[PDB]
Amino acid sequence: AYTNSFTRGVYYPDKVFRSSVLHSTQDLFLPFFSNVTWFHNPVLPFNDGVYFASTEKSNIIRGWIFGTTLDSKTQSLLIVNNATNVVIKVCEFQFCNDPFLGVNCTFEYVSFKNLREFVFKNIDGYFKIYSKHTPINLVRDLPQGFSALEPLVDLPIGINITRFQTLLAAYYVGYLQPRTFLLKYNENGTITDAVDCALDPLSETK
Amino acid sequence: STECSNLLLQYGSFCTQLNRALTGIAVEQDKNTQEVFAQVKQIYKTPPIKDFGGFNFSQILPDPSKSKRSFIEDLLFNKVTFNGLTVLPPLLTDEMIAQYTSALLAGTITSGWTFGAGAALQIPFAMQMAYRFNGIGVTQNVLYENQKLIANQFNSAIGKIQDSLSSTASALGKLQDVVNQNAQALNTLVKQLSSNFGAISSVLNDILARLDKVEAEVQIDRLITGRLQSLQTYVTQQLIRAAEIRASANLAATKMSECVLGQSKRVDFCGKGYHLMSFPQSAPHGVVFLHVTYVPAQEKNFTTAPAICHDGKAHFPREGVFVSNGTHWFVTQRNFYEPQIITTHNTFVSGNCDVVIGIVNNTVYDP
Amino acid sequence: IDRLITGRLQSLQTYVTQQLIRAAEIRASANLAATKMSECVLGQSKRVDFCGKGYHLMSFPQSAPHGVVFLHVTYVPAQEKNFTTAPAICHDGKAHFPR
Amino acid sequence: STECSNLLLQYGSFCTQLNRALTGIAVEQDKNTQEVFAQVKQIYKTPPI
Amino acid sequence: CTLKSFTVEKGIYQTSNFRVQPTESIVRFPNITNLCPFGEVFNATRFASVYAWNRKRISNCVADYSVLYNSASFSTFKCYGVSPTKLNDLCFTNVYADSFVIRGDEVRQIAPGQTGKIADYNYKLPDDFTGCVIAWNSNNLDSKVGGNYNYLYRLFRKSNLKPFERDISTEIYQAGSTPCNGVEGFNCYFPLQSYGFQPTYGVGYQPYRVVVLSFELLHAPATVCGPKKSTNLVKNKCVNFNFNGLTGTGVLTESNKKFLPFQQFGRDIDDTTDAVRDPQTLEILDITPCSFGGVSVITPGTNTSNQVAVLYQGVNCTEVNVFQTRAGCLIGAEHVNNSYECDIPIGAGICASYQTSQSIIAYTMSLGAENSVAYSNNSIAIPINFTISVTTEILPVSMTKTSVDCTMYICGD
Numbered sequence A: 001a002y003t004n005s006f007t008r009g010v011y012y013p014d015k016v017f018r019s020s021v022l023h024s025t026q027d028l029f030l031p032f033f034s035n036v037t038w039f040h041n042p043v044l045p046f047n048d049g050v051y052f053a054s055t056e057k058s059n060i061i062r063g064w065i066f067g068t069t070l071d072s073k074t075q076s077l078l079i080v081n082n083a084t085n086v087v088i089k090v091c092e093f094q095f096c097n098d099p100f101l102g103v104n105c106t107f108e109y110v111s112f113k114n115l116r117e118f119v120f121k122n123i124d125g126y127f128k129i130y131s132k133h134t135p136i137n138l139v140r141d142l143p144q145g146f147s148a149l150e151p152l153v154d155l156p157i158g159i160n161i162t163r164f165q166t167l168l169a170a171y172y173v174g175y176l177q178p179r180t181f182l183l184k185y186n187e188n189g190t191i192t193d194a195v196d197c198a199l200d201p202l203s204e205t206k
Numbered sequence B: 001s002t003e004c005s006n007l008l009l010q011y012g013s014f015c016t017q018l019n020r021a022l023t024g025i026a027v028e029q030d031k032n033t034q035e036v037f038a039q040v041k042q043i044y045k046t047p048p049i050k051d052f053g054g055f056n057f058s059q060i061l062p063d064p065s066k067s068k069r070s071f072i073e074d075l076l077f078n079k080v081t082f083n084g085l086t087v088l089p090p091l092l093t094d095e096m097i098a099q100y101t102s103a104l105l106a107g108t109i110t111s112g113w114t115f116g117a118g119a120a121l122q123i124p125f126a127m128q129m130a131y132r133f134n135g136i137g138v139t140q141n142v143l144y145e146n147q148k149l150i151a152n153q154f155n156s157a158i159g160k161i162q163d164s165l166s167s168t169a170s171a172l173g174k175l176q177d178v179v180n181q182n183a184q185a186l187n188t189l190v191k192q193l194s195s196n197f198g199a200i201s202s203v204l205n206d207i208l209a210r211l212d213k214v215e216a217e218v219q220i221d222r223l224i225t226g227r228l229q230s231l232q233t234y235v236t237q238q239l240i241r242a243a244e245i246r247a248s249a250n251l252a253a254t255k256m257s258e259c260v261l262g263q264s265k266r267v268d269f270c271g272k273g274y275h276l277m278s279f280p281q282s283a284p285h286g287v288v289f290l291h292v293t294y295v296p297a298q299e300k301n302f303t304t305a306p307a308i309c310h311d312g313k314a315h316f317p318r319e320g321v322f323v324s325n326g327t328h329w330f331v332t333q334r335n336f337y338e339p340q341i342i343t344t345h346n347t348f349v350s351g352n353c354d355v356v357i358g359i360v361n362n363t364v365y366d367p
Numbered sequence C: 001i002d003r004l005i006t007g008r009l010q011s012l013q014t015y016v017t018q019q020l021i022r023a024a025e026i027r028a029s030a031n032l033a034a035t036k037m038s039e040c041v042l043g044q045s046k047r048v049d050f051c052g053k054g055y056h057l058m059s060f061p062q063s064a065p066h067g068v069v070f071l072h073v074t075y076v077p078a079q080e081k082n083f084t085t086a087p088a089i090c091h092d093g094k095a096h097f098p099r
Numbered sequence D: 001s002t003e004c005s006n007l008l009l010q011y012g013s014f015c016t017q018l019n020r021a022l023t024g025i026a027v028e029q030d031k032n033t034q035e036v037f038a039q040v041k042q043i044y045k046t047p048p049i
Numbered sequence E: 001c002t003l004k005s006f007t008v009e010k011g012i013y014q015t016s017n018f019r020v021q022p023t024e025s026i027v028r029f030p031n032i033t034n035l036c037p038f039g040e041v042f043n044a045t046r047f048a049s050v051y052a053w054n055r056k057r058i059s060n061c062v063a064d065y066s067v068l069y070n071s072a073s074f075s076t077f078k079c080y081g082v083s084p085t086k087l088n089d090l091c092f093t094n095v096y097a098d099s100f101v102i103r104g105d106e107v108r109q110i111a112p113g114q115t116g117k118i119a120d121y122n123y124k125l126p127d128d129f130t131g132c133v134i135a136w137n138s139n140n141l142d143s144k145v146g147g148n149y150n151y152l153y154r155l156f157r158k159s160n161l162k163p164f165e166r167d168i169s170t171e172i173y174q175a176g177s178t179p180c181n182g183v184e185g186f187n188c189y190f191p192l193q194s195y196g197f198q199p200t201y202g203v204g205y206q207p208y209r210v211v212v213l214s215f216e217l218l219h220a221p222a223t224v225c226g227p228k229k230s231t232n233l234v235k236n237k238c239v240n241f242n243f244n245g246l247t248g249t250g251v252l253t254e255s256n257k258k259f260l261p262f263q264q265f266g267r268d269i270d271d272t273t274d275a276v277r278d279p280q281t282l283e284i285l286d287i288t289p290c291s292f293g294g295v296s297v298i299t300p301g302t303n304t305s306n307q308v309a310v311l312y313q314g315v316n317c318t319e320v321n322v323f324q325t326r327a328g329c330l331i332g333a334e335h336v337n338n339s340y341e342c343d344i345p346i347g348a349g350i351c352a353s354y355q356t357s358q359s360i361i362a363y364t365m366s367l368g369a370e371n372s373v374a375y376s377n378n379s380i381a382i383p384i385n386f387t388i389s390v391t392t393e394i395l396p397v398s399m400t401k402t403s404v405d406c407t408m409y410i411c412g413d
C-alpha cells in the first residue's frame, strides 16, 4: 500500500539561525506530494537517504539496523531505544535473520495519538539523524500540515550504507532526492513554511 | 589583506577612477534635489486663519503634530518601504525638503503665479482662481457664480487622494522601483564576493593557507580579476541608472517651474483637462504633484454658424461661437454654455454676406 | 605580452564606455540649448523660469568655447502698494466684473 | 555544453544580471509604444460623409 | 597630494580611508572533555617479545603527548612525520601504541623505511610513517642472573619485511647441507633467537622497554584530536575572533536573539555572518564590523587660508575642537548656534564655512529668510514700478572630438 506525503519531510539543513527571511537551499529532500510506502518488515534499500515515520500510542517500534550487507562481513549500525535512552553501536554483527527483543565493535554511543517522524542520510562518512514528534487525531495517514525535523545526532561513523530494516503499529517509508527548496524562517528563527521549487510552475515562480 | 593589496597595485589607476565615478553620482543627487525644491527664495508661511473662500488645504498644508509633513506627505512616507560599501546622507534632510514644499505651497495659495516672477504679491484666493479660469478661456464670472460648488468639487477631489493613497501603495511604484533597483544592485555586488572566478577558493586567506608564495599569487590574481570586473560592472550600471534619474529630476524641476510656479498651457503636461494649478508634496526619493484641472462634464448639441448676416454686413463673434436653441440665435463662450444676445459689442463686421460658406440670417441688436 | 594586451584592452573599453555615457549628457544639454534658441531667442516663451526669472521679454545668444550663453531679458515687478479689492461691483441691481 | 556550463557557474551572478538587463530593455519598448500612441481612451471613427 | 596640485580651491575633498584595526585576538572553543589515557598506557602491566609486538588502540579522546618528552624518565626519544611539540594541535582517524623489549643497540633502528634487524625482520615501518619512539633502559627488570631467555627476536629470514608485516612463521632456517627436520644443529637454526639478558651486560646489550606511538589519518574523519586554548570574552572592542573555527574581524556585543539548541551561527540577508553563540557561556553575541569610512578635508582654499577641518564620514567620534554631526565626526571646526547659507556642504543639513581671529565653523544651513505673506480676503498688492533684468545662462553643447587608434594604443610598432 501507499500514501501521499503532502508537505512533510523538511528538516533544518544547517546549524544556522536565520530570521524573518526566505532561504533557498539545494539538498536531499522528500519531494512534496510524493507517494510513500505504508506498513502495518523486509530489508529495504537505503538509496541516497530515507524519510521514516510512524503513527503511535503504544511504543511497538524500538529501533533500526543499517549497512551494505547488514550482516557479519563488515561494520553495521544498530540503533535501539532501550525504554530509557537511545543506544547506538556500529559492530560487525553476525545478526539473526530477523529482529529480536527483550520482550567486532569499533564505536558506541548513548543518548493512535502521536506522529513520530525521522530522516536518515549518510554523507562524507557522517550519518545524520533528524526528527520531530507531535500529537495527532487522524488514524490512517501522515497528517496534512507542516513542521520541520531537527538534528538529533551527527555521527562520524566512516561506514557505508545501501540497505536498512525496522526493529519492532503503523509506519511509512519514503526516499530523499536531490531538490531545490525555498524555506521560510519566522522572527523566532524556526522554519514555518516551505516550497519544493520543481513541484509545479507556480512553485518555480515563487 | 596586504598580500592581495600588493598585487592590486599592478592594475594602476583602475581602483581610483571607480571612486571618482561614484563621487560624480553622489554629488549629482544633491544637485537633482536642490534644483527641484529650492526654486523659492524665501520661506513663505501661511496666515494663522484659513480664509481661502471655501477651498480646504488642511490635508496638504503642514501639520505641527506630524517631522512637519502634511497629512498627505505622511501617507507618501508610509507607502514607500558592508565590505567597504558605504551609504552617504543627502545634503537636505527630509525636514528641509518638507520646509521647501511648505514654502512653495504657502506662496502658491497666498500669492498665485507672482512669487515665481519676483516678490510674492498677495491676492484673495477666490480672485486668484477667477484669474486662473481666464487662463483656460472661461470668463471669471463663471467662478464667482459657482464658487461654493467649485470649492466642494475641489475639497471632495482632495478627499479621494487620501482614500486612494491610504488604501493602495500601487501608485508609488515609480519611487519603490528606484529603492528596489539600488537594493538589487548592492545584493548582487556583495554576493559576487563568494564566487571563485576559477580560483581554488573564494576565501582569500584559504588561498594563502593551501599554497606556496608564487603558487598563491597566481590564484589571488583570479579573485582580483573577477572582483575588479564585478565592481566595474556595478559602477557602469549606476552611471546608466543615474542618467535616467537625472532626466526625471530635470522633468520634476520643469513641472515645479511650469505647473506649480505658473499655469501651463501645454496639453497633458500638468495632468489631463485644462490646467488651473498644482501643489507639490514630498515623497521618499521623489516629488508628487497634485494637478488641479477643469474638465467639461455635460453637453448638448446646438445648431451653429460661422457668421450671421444683418443688413448686408457679415458679423463674426469676437470671443465666442454662435449657437441656436432651435428658434433663437445666441453667442456663447466656447468652454461653458452661457448664451448672450447677439449685439454690435459681441461681434465685428467684415464685408458682404456672399463670401462666407454657411452664413445665416439674424437680427444684430445695437444698444 | 598577453597580460599587457588584456589590461590595455580593458583600460580602453573603460574609457570608451565613460565617453559614451558622457556624450549622452552633453547631447541632452545640446538638445536643451537648441530648444532655448528656438523658444527664447526666435520667439517669446511663456514657460515659467525657462528663459530666466521674471516675465520673459527676449533673449540674445552669445557663443563660448564648447557651449552657448543666453542673455535673458525679463520684466520684474519692483515696488508695490496694498489696496482694498473686490471680485465684482454692484450698480443698478446688477453685478459688473472687470473686462 | 555541460562541461562548459559547470565552469560558467564559478563566475556567479554575471549571467543572471545580463539576462535581467536585456529583459529590462525589452519591456521598455512596449512602454515607449504605449506612451506615444495610447493617448486616447476610445476608438473615435470618422462619419461616412 | 590627492589633487596632484600645490594650490587647493575652496571645497571638501576625500583624501583617504579610515579603518579601526583589530586591537587583540579572541579565541573560544568547547569545554575540554575525555583526555586520552597515555600516562596510564606508559605504566601498562605487560610487555612482549619483538617478533610478536603488542598494539594498544586509541580513539574517541583528546590528546596530550607533552609529558612523553617534558619528563626526562625516558632514556631514548625520537619522532617522525610530525615534530613532538606540534602533535598537541593535530587530529587522527586512528592512534596506536606499539610495545616490545630489545637491546639498546637496536632501539636506534626503529624509523620510517630504515634498515636494522628489528625493523627488517620484526617491526617494519613505511616510508611515510608518523609516530614517536619512547624508550627506557629496563636492565633492573628484564635482565636475569644466568641470562633471561624469555624475550625473542627474528634473527633469520630469506628477505626483509613489508610495512607492519607481523610475521610469526617458525620453521628452521637451513644454512647449508644439514636437512632441517624441525631441529637445530650445524648450519641449521631456529629463526627466532634470544638476547639472554644478564644484569652485568654493557649498555648496548642491556634491555630497553619501548613504546612506539603510531598515528594514522584516512578518508574516514578523525577520532583523536589536540585540545585548544581560549581567551577572555572582550565585548565592545574591535578584535580578531574565532568561535569553533568561525573566524572574523569585528566588535562583539550582546543581543536579544534566541538561537534554537542546535544553531551556532547567525546570518544576515546577504549570507554575511552577524551573530554567534559562545561555546562556554551560551550568550548570543551580535557581530558588527570594525568601523571604517572616507576621510574628507574641508578647506576655505589656500588662496585665503591654510586652516582645515576633517570629516570622518559615518564614524562616531568615540572611535577616531571635536563635533559629532549625523554625517560623521567633524574635527577642527566650531559648532556655531546660528544658521547661514551653505558655503561648503557636509551632509544631513550641516555645512561648514571660514568666518570671524577667523576659524572654520559648522552650522545647520538656512533655507531662506522667513516671510509672512500679508494675506487677507480683500487685500491685493499691485506693483507701482518695474525693473528690466538681464540674466546669464550657460549651456555646454559639444565635446572635443577625440579619436583613439586601438591597435596603436594597445601595441604600437
Ligand SMILES: *[C@@H]1O[C@H](CO)[C@@H](O)[C@H](O)[C@H]1NC(C)=O
Pocket: A159, A160, E219
Ligand atoms: C565503502 O567504504 C570505503 C572506505 O574506504 C570506500 O573506499 C568505498 O568507496 C565505499 N563504497 C563502496 C561501494 O565500497
Ligand SMILES: *[C@@H]1O[C@H](CO)[C@@H](O)[C@H](O)[C@H]1NC(C)=O
Pocket: A186, A187, A188, E258
Ligand atoms: C519569539 O519568541 C517569544 C518567546 O520566546 C515570543 O514572545 C514572540 O512572540 C516570538 N515572536 C514571534 C514573531 O512569534
Ligand SMILES: *[C@@H]1O[C@H](CO)[C@@H](O)[C@H](O)[C@H]1NC(C)=O
Pocket: B050, B054, B055, B056, B058
Ligand atoms: C477642512 O476640513 C476639515 C476636516 O478635514 C474640517 O474640520 C474644516 O472645518 C474644513 N475647513 C474648511 C475651511 O472647509
Ligand SMILES: *[C@@H]1O[C@H](CO)[C@@H](O)[C@H](O)[C@H]1NC(C)=O
Pocket: B299, B300, B301
Ligand atoms: C447629438 O446628436 C447625435 C446624432 O443625433 C446623437 O447621437 C447624440 O446623442 C446627441 N447628443 C450628444 C451629447 O452628442
Ligand SMILES: *[C@@H]1O[C@H](CO)[C@@H](O)[C@H](O)[C@H]1NC(C)=O
Pocket: B325, B326, B327, B328
Ligand atoms: C430659445 O430661446 C428663447 C429666448 O427667449 C426661449 O423663449 C425659448 O423657450 C428657447 N427654447 C426653444 C426650444 O426655442
Ligand SMILES: *[C@@H]1O[C@H](CO)[C@@H](O)[C@H](O)[C@H]1NC(C)=O
Pocket: B304, B305, B357, B358, B359
Ligand atoms: C451644410 O451642408 C448643407 C448640405 O450640403 C448645405 O446646404 C449648407 O450650406 C452647409 N452649411 C450649413 C451652415 O448648413
Ligand SMILES: *[C@@H]1O[C@H](CO)[C@@H](O)[C@H](O)[C@H]1NC(C)=O
Pocket: B312, B361
Ligand atoms: C437671407 O437674407 C437675404 C436678404 O437679406 C436673402 O436674399 C436670402 O435669400 C436670405 N436667405 C435665407 C436662407 O433666408
Ligand SMILES: *[C@@H]1O[C@H](CO)[C@@H](O)[C@H](O)[C@H]1NC(C)=O
Pocket: C080, C081, C082, E374, E381
Ligand atoms: C500690507 O498690509 C499689511 C497689514 O497692515 C502689512 O503688514 C504689509 O507690510 C503691507 N504690505 C505692503 C507692501 O505695504
Ligand SMILES: *[C@@H]1O[C@H](CO)[C@@H](O)[C@H](O)[C@H]1NC(C)=O
Pocket: E031, E279, E280, E281, E282
Ligand atoms: C563550561 O565550564 C565552566 C566551568 O566549569 C562553566 O561555568 C560553564 O557553564 C560550562 N559551559 C557549558 C556549556 O557546559
Ligand SMILES: *[C@@H]1O[C@H](CO)[C@@H](O)[C@H](O)[C@H]1NC(C)=O
Pocket: E316, E317, E318, E324
Ligand atoms: C557614539 O558612540 C557612543 C559610545 O558607544 C554612544 O554613547 C553615542 O550614543 C554614539 N552617538 C551616535 C550619534 O552614534
Ligand SMILES: *[C@@H]1O[C@H](CO)[C@@H](O)[C@H](O)[C@H]1NC(C)=O
Pocket: E335, E336, E337
Ligand atoms: C544653542 O542653543 C540651545 C537653545 O538655546 C542651547 O541649549 C545650547 O546650549 C546652545 N549652545 C550650543 C553651542 O549648542
Ligand SMILES: *[C@@H]1O[C@H](CO)[C@@H](O)[C@H](O)[C@H]1NC(C)=O
Pocket: C079, E384, E385, E386, E387
Ligand atoms: C521706478 O524705478 C526707477 C529706477 O528703477 C526710478 O528711477 C523711478 O523714479 C521709479 N518710479 C517710481 C514711481 O517709483
